[PDB]
Design a binder for these strands. Structure first.
Ligand code: 3CO
Ligand code: K
Ligand code: MG
Ligand code: MG
Ligand code: MG
Ligand code: MG
Ligand code: MG
Ligand code: MG
Ligand code: MG
Ligand code: MG
Ligand code: MG
Ligand code: MG
Length: 74
RNA sequence: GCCAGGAUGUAUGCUUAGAAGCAGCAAUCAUUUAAAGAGUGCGUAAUAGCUCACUGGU
C-alpha cells in the first residue's frame, strides 16, 4: 500500500545521458545522444507510473521527453 | 442551453528568488482515449483554484 514514486522521465534521461542539464533550444542544440536499449530500460523502470499499453508506447513517451530536451536516440 | 468528462509521461526542456498549461526563451513530443492544447482566458508569490478548446449525453 506504500506508493513508491519513480524519478521523472526527464531526470532519468539526464542520468542515462550523463548530463547536468537539458538543452534550452531542443531543436537547435543537441546536448547528448543515447541508445534505444537505454530508452528501453527507462521505459521499463518508469512503467508503473506510465499509462501505456505496451513498452513500445512507453518508449514513445520517453522519447518524446528526450526529443524535447535536446537528447537524441540511436 | 443544461448535465457530464476535459486525463497521462509531466512541475516538458531552459531560465528564474519562484516560473508547476498561462513572466520570458526554445520547442510543442508522446501516451490512454468518445474526447482532452506541452493549454483559451481569469487566477496564485509560486502552487491551488475558475475556465475554454475538444468529447459524450439531453
Ligand atoms: Co492526441
Ligand atoms: K511558467
Ligand atoms: Mg462542463
Ligand atoms: Mg471539473
Ligand atoms: Mg502535461
Ligand atoms: Mg522544469
Ligand atoms: Mg541568466
Ligand atoms: Mg512553462
Ligand atoms: Mg489546472
Ligand atoms: Mg502565471
Ligand atoms: Mg514562445
Ligand atoms: Mg486538458
Amino acid at each position: 500500500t506504500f506508493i513508491t514514486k519513480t524519478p521523472p522521465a526527464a531526470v532519468l534521461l539526464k542520468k542515462a545521458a550523463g548530463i547536468e542539464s537539458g538543452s534550452g533550444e531542443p531543436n537547435r542544440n543537441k546536448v547528448a545522444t543515447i541508445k534505444r536499449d537505454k530508452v528501453r530500460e527507462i521505459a521499463e523502470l518508469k512503467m508503473p507510473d506510465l499509462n501505456a499499453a505496451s513498452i513500445e508506447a512507453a518508449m514513445r513517451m520517453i522519447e518524446g521527453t528526450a526529443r524535447n530536451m535536446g537528447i537524441v536516440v540511436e
